């Protein structure tokens, strides 16, 4: 259970009861004039908990920009060998929706002892309440991007400062697999022998 707050994300690895339509409710306390977050609109029970952690907020704003950034935010989640590691990034994007041609390098945030297999999930939300107008819900608009990982061999080009720009998949096309043989992003004019192929049995 990853919960971002105003401002201490309290990562949680526990045993919960997640509702049929889980998401974080947000309301107005009237005491100290602060917008709290009701966290049990996500899940009813919190008990048995195995792990807990807190860090500086992964989700972060900048704004003042009237757009032209959109603050494109990416998070990679990979669960292996007892370490489920989180990755992040923040990028400006001027395009209406979809992604540019640029490379996005994601550093590992925390490498945590998770030890559980995660086969399924859903995201979380922040909504609020409104008052009499012709209850209020679905603040603004929400959309995001999801894709699944896969084992692949990449050639990684670090920079003088170690900032990876160009990465190339080997299996992407018969052309991409040869660049992994020369290890170079420059491919000199000529013929190169990429890995062999076999006909397979019916």
């Amino acid at each position, epitope marked *: 259970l990853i919960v971002n707050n105003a401002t201490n994300v309290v990562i949680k690895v526990c045993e919960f009861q997640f509702c049929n339509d889980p998401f974080l409710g947000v*309301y*107005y*306390h*009237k*005491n100290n*004039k602060s917008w709290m977050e*009701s966290e049990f609109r996500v899940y009813s029970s919190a008990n048995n908990c195995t792990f807990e952690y807190v860090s500086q907020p992964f989700l972060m704003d900048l704004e003042g920009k009237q757009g032209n950034f959109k603050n494109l935010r990416e998070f990679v989640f990979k669960n292996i060998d007892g370490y489920f590691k989180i990755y992040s990034k923040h990028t400006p994007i001027n395009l209406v929706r979809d992604l540019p041609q640029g490379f996005s390098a994601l550093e590992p945030l925390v490498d945590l002892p998770i030890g559980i297999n995660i086969t399924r999930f859903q995201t979380l939300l922040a909504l609020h*309440r409104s*008052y*009499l107008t*012709p*209850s209020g819900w679905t603040a603004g608009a929400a959309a995001y991007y999801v894709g699944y990982l896969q084992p692949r061999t990449f050639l990684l080009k670090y920079n003088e400062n170690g900032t990876i720009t160009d990465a190339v998949d080997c299996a992407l096309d018969p052309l991409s697999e040869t660049k992994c043989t020369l290890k170079s992003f420059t491919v000199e004019k000529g013929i190169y022998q990429t890995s062999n192929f076999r006909v397979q049995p019916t």
Partner: antibody
Framework: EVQLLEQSGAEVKKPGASVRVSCKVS????????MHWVRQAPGKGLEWMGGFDPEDGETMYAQKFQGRVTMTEDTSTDTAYMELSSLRSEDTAVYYCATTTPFSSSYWFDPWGQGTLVTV | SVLTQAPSVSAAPGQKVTISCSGSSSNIGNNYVSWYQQLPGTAPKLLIY???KRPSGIPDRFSGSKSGTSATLGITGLQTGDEADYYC???????????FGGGTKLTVL
């Protein structure tokens, strides 16, 4: 949107008593929205009472009736108790649970509590 | 209470006639006005808020206006079920509270 719970129920208290009024809600949580109270005497008009102040954050008390009636709040159980004291002649009447919205300037009392008469 | 409106008013059905409430600058002048309806022994229902705004479920046939210290509640398309008392209110900074008028019980003739 929202329906409420009743204001009291039927509370009949002979002279020499005093009565709390516990108004609960449904579909909202208690301290996202402010309550209010109005005296309504049958065959008569409205007299506002109790109430919360969007400004200054205080829970208001009608100056005319100030000090005789008090209010407390239990946020989780949504129970807001209106205790009126020192029964008098004309003070038996329907006292409505009403609500405004902390955002922002709302004077209007919004879905309300069906009414409860008291007894002196 | 501290405001001005008559006990009762009467008109023929299906007609167009309104009801007004006379306040002061200390009450209606700087503040927004609301209007309420109650049937005998029933739950007083919000009619119009800020005099220009209809709550959910209100016939559009109702309107409102604020001229100086005077606030009229637009009442049109009279119905046989429209007989009831209408109450004016607006925020008061004088006693710093909520005020109302005595109420005006309409009668559809």
């Amino acid at each position: 949107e929202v329906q409420l719970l009743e204001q009291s129920g039927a509370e009949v208290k002979k002279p020499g008593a005093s009565v709390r009024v516990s108004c609960k809600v449904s579909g909202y949580t208690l301290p996202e929205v402010a309550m209010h109270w109005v005296r309504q005497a049958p065959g008569k008009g409205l007299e506002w009472m109790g109430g919360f102040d969007p400004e200054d954050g205080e829970t208001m008390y009608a100056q005319k009736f100030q000090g005789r009636v008090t209010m407390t709040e239990d946020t989780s159980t949504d129970t807001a108790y209106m205790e009126l004291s020192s029964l008098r002649s004309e003070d038996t009447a329907v006292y409505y649970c009403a609500t405004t919205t902390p955002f922002s300037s709302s004077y209007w009392f919004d879905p309300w509590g069906q009414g409860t008469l008291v007894t002196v | 209470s501290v405001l001005t409106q008559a006990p009762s008013v009467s008109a023929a059905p299906g007609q167009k006639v309104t009801i007004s409430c006379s306040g002061s600058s200390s009450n209606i002048g700087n503040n927004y006005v609301s209007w309420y309806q109650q049937l005998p022994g029933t739950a007083p229902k919000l009619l119009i808020y800020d005099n220009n705004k209809r709550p959910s479920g209100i016939p559009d046939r109702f309107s409102g206006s604020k001229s100086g210290t005077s606030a009229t509640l637009g009442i049109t398309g009279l119905q046989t079920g429209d007989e009831a008392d209408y109450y004016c209110g607006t925020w008061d900074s004088s006693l710093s509270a909520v005020v109302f008028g005595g109420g005006t019980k309409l009668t559809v003739l």
